[PDB]
Amino acid sequence: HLESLTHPGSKVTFPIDTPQNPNLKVFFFAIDNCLYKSSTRIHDLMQQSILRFFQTHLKLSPEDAHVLNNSYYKEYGLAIRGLVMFHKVNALEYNRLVDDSLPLQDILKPDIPLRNMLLRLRQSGKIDKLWLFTNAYKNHAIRCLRLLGIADLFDGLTYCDYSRTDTLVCKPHVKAFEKAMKESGLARYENAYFIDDSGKNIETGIKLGMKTCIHLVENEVNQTPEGAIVISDILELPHVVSDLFLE
Numbered sequence: 195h196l197e198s199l200t201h202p203g204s205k206v207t208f209p210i211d212t213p214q215n216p217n218l219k220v221f222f223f224a225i226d227n228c229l230y231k232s233s234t235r236i237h238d239l240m241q242q243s244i245l246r247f248f249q250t251h252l253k254l255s256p257e258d259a260h261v262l263n264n265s266y267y268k269e270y271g272l273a274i275r276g277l278v279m280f281h282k283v284n285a286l287e288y289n290r291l292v293d294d295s296l297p298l299q300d301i302l303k304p305d306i307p308l309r310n311m312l313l314r315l316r317q318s319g320k321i322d323k324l325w326l327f328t329n330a331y332k333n334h335a336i337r338c339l340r341l342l343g344i345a346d347l348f349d350g351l352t353y354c355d356y357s358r359t360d361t362l363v364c365k366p367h368v369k370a371f372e373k374a375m376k377e378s379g380l381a382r383y384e385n386a387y388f389i390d391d392s393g394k395n396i397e398t399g400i401k402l403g404m405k406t407c408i409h410l411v412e413n414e415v416n417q418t419p420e421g422a423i424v425i426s427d428i429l430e431l432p433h434v435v436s437d438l439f440l441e
């Protein structure tokens with residue numbers, strides 16, 4: 195459990211789960227491989243668990259597990275979306291064996307430079323809300339925020355609802371963006387900024403008319419769409435949207 199964390203940002207201060215100012219400005223943030231580095235190898239651990247699930251639950255050889263995992267991931271943005279639809283997998287049981295079994299407490303540590311950068315972004319007055327927009331389920335999302343010491347830095351969370359049993363609504367699908375817009379109180383896309391490591395997700399935000407979309411590419415792409423700004427480290431946001439950090 196994480197109830198013994200005492201460092202700043204270790205407590206969630208926004209609500210999980212009525213009009214507002216229309217001129218609202220919102221910066222959306224992906225979480226995985228965004229608020230922490232892809233070199234943490236957390237994504238590798240996730241893929242290991244996911245591939246194990248395909249093998250143990252779908253009785254597939256490792257090579258066929260890779261093919262099916264990649265196929266679903268490519269077209270859906272989440273393998274679990276395909277497992278739900280075609281294999282009648284329960285997404286919450288899956289989630290217990292995958293994201294929720296990661297040894298995060300041994301990997302993620304408070305990220306003070308990230309905390310300070312986000313504080314500066316909140317304090318300029320240029321952005322009204324920092325909103326999390328993740329394909330993870332809420333358990334994992336919250337756990338990452340608390341461990342990284344940034345859980346008080348966001349005004350809300352839009353996560354993929356793994357409780358659904360027909361399909362999952364997730365990035366890069368437009369319905370996921372619509373949900374993020376509604377939940378955050380965002381009136382127009384043109385009042386939104388977005389950072390994500392997924393090229394396809396960035397592609398959707400751009401196509402939808404978001405103001406500025408930043409594609410986070412640490413080393414090599416796992417493709418960057420027309421109109422996106424590329425950085426290799428989230429701490430480079432101050433380099434590329436500098437004005438948002440100034441009063």
Ligand SMILES: [Mg+2]
Nearest residue numbers: 224226227391
């Ligand atoms: Mg990601």
